[PDB]
Amino acid sequence: PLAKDLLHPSPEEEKRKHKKKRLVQSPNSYFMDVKCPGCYKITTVFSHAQTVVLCVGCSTVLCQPTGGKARLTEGCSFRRKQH
Amino acid sequence: AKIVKPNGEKPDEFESGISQALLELEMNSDLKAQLRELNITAAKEIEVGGGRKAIIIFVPVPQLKSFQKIQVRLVRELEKKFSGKHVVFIAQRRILPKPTRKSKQKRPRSRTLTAVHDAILEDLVFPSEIVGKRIRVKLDGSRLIKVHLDKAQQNNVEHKVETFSGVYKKLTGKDVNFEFPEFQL
Amino acid sequence: SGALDVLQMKEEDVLKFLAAGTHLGGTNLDFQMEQYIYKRKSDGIYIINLKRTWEKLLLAARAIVAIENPADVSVISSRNTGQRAVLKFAAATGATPIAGRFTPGTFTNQIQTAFREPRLLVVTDPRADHQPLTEASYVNLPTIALCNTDSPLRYVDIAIPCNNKGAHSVGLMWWMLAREVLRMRGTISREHPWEVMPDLYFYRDPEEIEKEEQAAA
Amino acid sequence: VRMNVLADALKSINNAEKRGKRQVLIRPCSKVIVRFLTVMMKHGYIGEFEIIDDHRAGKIVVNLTGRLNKCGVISPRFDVQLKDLEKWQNNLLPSRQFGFIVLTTSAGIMDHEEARRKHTGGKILGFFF
Amino acid sequence: GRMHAPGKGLSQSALPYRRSVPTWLKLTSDDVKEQIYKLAKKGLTPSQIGVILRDSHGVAQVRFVTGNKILRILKSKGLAPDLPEDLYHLIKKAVAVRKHLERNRKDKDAKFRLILIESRIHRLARYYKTKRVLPPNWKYESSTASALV
Amino acid sequence: MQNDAGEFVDLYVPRKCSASNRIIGAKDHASIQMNVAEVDKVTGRFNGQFKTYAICGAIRRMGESDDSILRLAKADGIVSKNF
RNA sequence: UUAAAGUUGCUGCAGUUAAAAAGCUCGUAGUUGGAUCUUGCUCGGCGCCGGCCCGAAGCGUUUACUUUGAAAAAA
RNA sequence: GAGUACACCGGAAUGAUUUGGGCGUGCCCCC
């Protein structure tokens, strides 16, 4: 349009835009925390896990590598966490 | 007491009194495992706008990370002792001169003016870290840097922004206002 | 409409809007109508925000009443949906009506019989009446067009977003624009219900005309 | 690839001024660029402008007005003297009553009239009228 | 655009604004340094060490928890390889392509890819010679891989 | 335009557009003389004074005259603030 | 032979169809290259009681650019 | 010591007593 404000946009159009084309450099990834129902403790796994990740103790696999976000093993719950 | 100086000047009686206050706090509380090996360099008196006042605490650089993890209770203890003076913690860094052609080992970029001012602005706001900064260049030519802070720890910091502006105007001379964005985080 | 609280939805204008259907539009988005809109839903009908429509209806009413003489306000329609509405609008306000087959060169060719030099143009639909919008470029004519979600925004000055496909919607909005301009002129008060009939500005097909006049007395 | 950052910035702000956009995004930033629009805004050709200060090369958003005709650069940066300044402004400007030449000078980046009245000169940057 | 390809791609990492060790992370510099030491004794590249750390052990970036990046620590010990990993991977790709060529003689496209790879390795080797990393007498021919795989 | 004498010398001054702040030429026939009637604050009837604006023809031909008139109404407060 | 020649285009030309971009890629010179960094340590003077300040033998990143001077035959 | 829930102590409120746990600090397990 003619007069569109670029000082501060709405967060919705910030989320539709590409991460490099945003007003500030903000990644589209996060860190998540999953646990096996048969196990007890909690491991922190990146969202794009990119490889087979194992919890220490050699019990169950957790994530499988894909093109984008990793596929979680069933029965495992994740939480969106902020630093 | 615990006041050290790189040169040969005895500290004045006001900073000696605040040092004796620090010694009676460490003798009072059970923090002697870690505050005993810590030191305070100097302090000043700042007359901010209105009927208020503030102090700056100079802390030497290599044990600043030790001061980070105990900062959340020392500020509360010095407000419960004397509530008429806001305290802040500022790491003391010196500024090496520019390598002009009139006048030597290389000057590192950690000691330059922009890096010292960036580190001072970072260490000025400890419970609320910097999420973004914008610079306003006003019509007369003067500059203005606005600082964005996260939504976490807002209940006790919003009344300190005038003191932060007064400290940063006294130390550097640049007008700084503070804002709190909420939609991104 | 101003910050004063005399020119908003009382209780019933929104009810008339939801009954007529001035809130839901077409099925394609327009880049000049990205703010006069809320969200596309399932079944693919975009929903027009209503307060913005009310504010531009006040703006169009203000622009009409701002000029002193009402005889040189050309109201234009060519589609069969709003032939009666613009004629009774010109009867109510005192405007000059053109209804069906607008002659080219009416504002440009001056030696012909159908010649007029007006001051304000009021257009029912921008896509259907693309010929008055072209003739409004050569002479200084501001215009007001009741726009839609699927209407290009070319040579327009005040856009009122509405569904200009149903006869009830255009008849009601032409009627209430007449109501607003006669209220602003100083003849109609806001305190009492003066209203003649919302159906009095409605176009209706000859088949339903015949069957309802045979059913009724 | 990108070599003259000021040329890209002035081409972008010239396109924004031609199409009537009030604000424009300039993707890289430099001290020479912010000093150039400091000269422009002190002369009154443009208005307020922000700097998106982040950990990369910054971004500049400006508040344009209608007092701007064209922004240009001179590439490569030729050096001029006090004798040859009138030769440049005779064939680079629309009139002798307005319009300015910004040139890099050891006393600071500044317009042609200040460089005339303090008797120094240097390499050229661009023009605006 | 790319160096030897006509296509243009916009796909890279986008590091966040904030420079801080996260509060949920309960690791100091010393234990993650010892873990980097252990995975270096395993025999991995700095890329593999970094992706393993950020995948399994919940670190944003090593540069934000230590004072410097991985390769400066690996050269601070002294067991880091004399051949840099980019040019080593280029030698491995080049010898794989060349070995594909001595059995497939009538393959012009693979010869073209080998020419592009030799261009890449010469262009990287002149930069490593400029930055005083390699001896100036080092050079690559068509039959030198057994000395450096 | 002034001179060194101190008196006006130009024959007339042209108007200014209210959106792009350009002038309107003598042979540009797409200009607007829009007037918006402001009303009394307790009754709502027309008081007598107008509020004029001007938009050049290129902004009309691109099609952004309506949002321009909306921004001028926002600046003048004739339209509601929240909108 | 010069201007008109913006028909030799450095200012300041053209390359879809009028005169015209190598069939395409790699490749050493040549050209062009992202952001950032704000004066002091042996001799003696306009004054004064072993002394304060100033002056100075000695040194205090090289380049391009820019400004002031010298030296620059006459017609 | 288990880490899904539990068997327990030292500080601190009222002379003597002690208030469900988990590590993903915020929502998960027994009522």
mmCIF file of N, CA and C in Angstrom, chain A residues 2-49:
data_model
loop_
_atom_site.group_PDB
_atom_site.id
_atom_site.type_symbol
_atom_site.label_atom_id
_atom_site.label_comp_id
_atom_site.label_asym_id
_atom_site.label_seq_id
_atom_site.Cartn_x
_atom_site.Cartn_y
_atom_site.Cartn_z
ATOM 1 N N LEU A 2 0.189 2.422 0.153
ATOM 2 C CA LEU A 2 0.899 3.696 0.122
ATOM 3 C C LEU A 2 1.641 3.946 1.431
ATOM 4 N N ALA A 3 0.911 4.002 2.540
ATOM 5 C CA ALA A 3 1.482 4.297 3.851
ATOM 6 C C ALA A 3 1.247 3.100 4.767
ATOM 7 N N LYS A 4 2.176 2.151 4.737
ATOM 8 C CA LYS A 4 2.166 1.003 5.630
ATOM 9 C C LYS A 4 3.292 1.168 6.642
ATOM 10 N N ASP A 5 2.970 0.988 7.920
ATOM 11 C CA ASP A 5 3.928 1.229 8.991
ATOM 12 C C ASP A 5 4.954 0.102 9.034
ATOM 13 N N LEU A 6 6.232 0.466 8.976
ATOM 14 C CA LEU A 6 7.327 -0.481 9.120
ATOM 15 C C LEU A 6 8.063 -0.324 10.442
ATOM 16 N N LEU A 7 7.621 0.599 11.301
ATOM 17 C CA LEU A 7 8.234 0.756 12.616
ATOM 18 C C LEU A 7 7.926 -0.440 13.506
ATOM 19 N N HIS A 8 6.661 -0.846 13.555
ATOM 20 C CA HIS A 8 6.253 -2.047 14.269
ATOM 21 C C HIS A 8 5.044 -2.676 13.578
ATOM 22 N N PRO A 9 5.163 -3.917 13.122
ATOM 23 C CA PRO A 9 4.023 -4.607 12.517
ATOM 24 C C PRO A 9 3.254 -5.433 13.543
ATOM 25 N N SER A 10 2.105 -5.937 13.102
ATOM 26 C CA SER A 10 1.386 -6.935 13.874
ATOM 27 C C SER A 10 2.180 -8.242 13.872
ATOM 28 N N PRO A 11 2.111 -9.022 14.960
ATOM 29 C CA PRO A 11 2.875 -10.283 15.010
ATOM 30 C C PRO A 11 2.431 -11.339 14.005
ATOM 31 N N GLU A 12 1.212 -11.240 13.460
ATOM 32 C CA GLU A 12 0.727 -12.232 12.503
ATOM 33 C C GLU A 12 1.527 -12.189 11.205
ATOM 34 N N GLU A 13 1.683 -10.995 10.621
ATOM 35 C CA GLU A 13 2.497 -10.860 9.416
ATOM 36 C C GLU A 13 3.980 -11.058 9.696
ATOM 37 N N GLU A 14 4.407 -10.901 10.950
ATOM 38 C CA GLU A 14 5.751 -11.318 11.325
ATOM 39 C C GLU A 14 5.886 -12.835 11.264
ATOM 40 N N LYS A 15 4.828 -13.565 11.635
ATOM 41 C CA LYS A 15 4.896 -15.022 11.556
ATOM 42 C C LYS A 15 4.745 -15.554 10.133
ATOM 43 N N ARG A 16 4.000 -14.868 9.252
ATOM 44 C CA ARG A 16 3.904 -15.376 7.880
ATOM 45 C C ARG A 16 5.199 -15.179 7.098
ATOM 46 N N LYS A 17 5.971 -14.141 7.415
ATOM 47 C CA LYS A 17 7.156 -13.811 6.634
ATOM 48 C C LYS A 17 8.278 -14.824 6.860
ATOM 49 N N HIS A 18 9.195 -14.873 5.894
ATOM 50 C CA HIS A 18 10.389 -15.696 6.005
ATOM 51 C C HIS A 18 11.302 -15.152 7.097
ATOM 52 N N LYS A 19 12.090 -16.052 7.697
ATOM 53 C CA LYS A 19 12.923 -15.682 8.841
ATOM 54 C C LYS A 19 14.044 -14.722 8.456
ATOM 55 N N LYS A 20 14.587 -14.843 7.244
ATOM 56 C CA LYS A 20 15.596 -13.896 6.791
ATOM 57 C C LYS A 20 14.980 -12.568 6.369
ATOM 58 N N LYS A 21 13.735 -12.586 5.897
ATOM 59 C CA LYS A 21 13.048 -11.387 5.439
ATOM 60 C C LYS A 21 12.280 -10.683 6.550
ATOM 61 N N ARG A 22 12.399 -11.154 7.790
ATOM 62 C CA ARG A 22 11.756 -10.500 8.918
ATOM 63 C C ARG A 22 12.461 -9.183 9.246
ATOM 64 N N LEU A 23 11.806 -8.379 10.088
ATOM 65 C CA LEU A 23 12.391 -7.111 10.519
ATOM 66 C C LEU A 23 13.617 -7.334 11.396
ATOM 67 N N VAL A 24 13.578 -8.352 12.253
ATOM 68 C CA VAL A 24 14.723 -8.757 13.054
ATOM 69 C C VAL A 24 14.942 -10.247 12.843
ATOM 70 N N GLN A 25 16.178 -10.691 13.053
ATOM 71 C CA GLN A 25 16.515 -12.092 12.835
ATOM 72 C C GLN A 25 15.927 -12.951 13.948
ATOM 73 N N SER A 26 14.876 -13.697 13.622
ATOM 74 C CA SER A 26 14.224 -14.585 14.575
ATOM 75 C C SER A 26 14.071 -15.970 13.958
ATOM 76 N N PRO A 27 14.603 -17.011 14.591
ATOM 77 C CA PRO A 27 14.501 -18.355 14.019
ATOM 78 C C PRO A 27 13.109 -18.943 14.183
ATOM 79 N N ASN A 28 12.797 -19.896 13.304
ATOM 80 C CA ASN A 28 11.521 -20.600 13.324
ATOM 81 C C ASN A 28 11.628 -21.963 13.998
ATOM 82 N N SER A 29 12.589 -22.125 14.902
ATOM 83 C CA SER A 29 12.806 -23.374 15.614
ATOM 84 C C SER A 29 12.767 -23.110 17.114
ATOM 85 N N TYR A 30 12.781 -24.190 17.889
ATOM 86 C CA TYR A 30 12.726 -24.102 19.342
ATOM 87 C C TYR A 30 13.323 -25.380 19.913
ATOM 88 N N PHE A 31 13.516 -25.380 21.227
ATOM 89 C CA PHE A 31 13.981 -26.553 21.950
ATOM 90 C C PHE A 31 12.818 -27.175 22.708
ATOM 91 N N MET A 32 12.712 -28.497 22.636
ATOM 92 C CA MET A 32 11.612 -29.221 23.252
ATOM 93 C C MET A 32 12.164 -30.274 24.202
ATOM 94 N N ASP A 33 11.299 -30.726 25.106
ATOM 95 C CA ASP A 33 11.667 -31.686 26.143
ATOM 96 C C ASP A 33 10.700 -32.863 26.122
ATOM 97 N N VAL A 34 11.233 -34.057 25.871
ATOM 98 C CA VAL A 34 10.430 -35.263 25.742
ATOM 99 C C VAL A 34 10.955 -36.314 26.712
ATOM 100 N N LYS A 35 10.085 -37.266 27.040
ATOM 101 C CA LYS A 35 10.460 -38.376 27.900
ATOM 102 C C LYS A 35 9.726 -39.630 27.448
ATOM 103 N N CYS A 36 10.361 -40.772 27.668
ATOM 104 C CA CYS A 36 9.737 -42.052 27.373
ATOM 105 C C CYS A 36 8.787 -42.439 28.506
ATOM 106 N N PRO A 37 7.594 -42.951 28.183
ATOM 107 C CA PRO A 37 6.694 -43.443 29.243
ATOM 108 C C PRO A 37 7.257 -44.615 30.028
ATOM 109 N N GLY A 38 8.051 -45.481 29.390
ATOM 110 C CA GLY A 38 8.706 -46.555 30.112
ATOM 111 C C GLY A 38 9.905 -46.121 30.926
ATOM 112 N N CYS A 39 10.498 -44.979 30.593
ATOM 113 C CA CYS A 39 11.637 -44.442 31.316
ATOM 114 C C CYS A 39 11.152 -43.446 32.368
ATOM 115 N N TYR A 40 12.088 -42.708 32.963
ATOM 116 C CA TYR A 40 11.750 -41.840 34.083
ATOM 117 C C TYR A 40 12.210 -40.402 33.875
ATOM 118 N N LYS A 41 13.360 -40.207 33.240
ATOM 119 C CA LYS A 41 13.982 -38.893 33.187
ATOM 120 C C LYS A 41 13.734 -38.211 31.847
ATOM 121 N N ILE A 42 14.089 -36.930 31.796
ATOM 122 C CA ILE A 42 13.705 -36.026 30.718
ATOM 123 C C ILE A 42 14.957 -35.586 29.974
ATOM 124 N N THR A 43 14.926 -35.694 28.648
ATOM 125 C CA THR A 43 16.001 -35.228 27.785
ATOM 126 C C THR A 43 15.509 -34.078 26.915
ATOM 127 N N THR A 44 16.403 -33.129 26.646
ATOM 128 C CA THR A 44 16.090 -31.959 25.835
ATOM 129 C C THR A 44 16.580 -32.193 24.410
ATOM 130 N N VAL A 45 15.649 -32.187 23.458
ATOM 131 C CA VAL A 45 15.928 -32.485 22.058
ATOM 132 C C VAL A 45 15.571 -31.262 21.222
ATOM 133 N N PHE A 46 16.432 -30.938 20.258
ATOM 134 C CA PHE A 46 16.150 -29.881 19.295
ATOM 135 C C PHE A 46 14.983 -30.283 18.395
ATOM 136 N N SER A 47 14.283 -29.271 17.865
ATOM 137 C CA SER A 47 13.094 -29.519 17.048
ATOM 138 C C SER A 47 13.443 -30.217 15.739
ATOM 139 N N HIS A 48 14.481 -29.746 15.052
ATOM 140 C CA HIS A 48 14.991 -30.414 13.857
ATOM 141 C C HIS A 48 16.171 -31.275 14.296
ATOM 142 N N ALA A 49 15.843 -32.485 14.758
ATOM 143 C CA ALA A 49 16.820 -33.340 15.424
ATOM 144 C C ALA A 49 17.849 -33.926 14.471
#
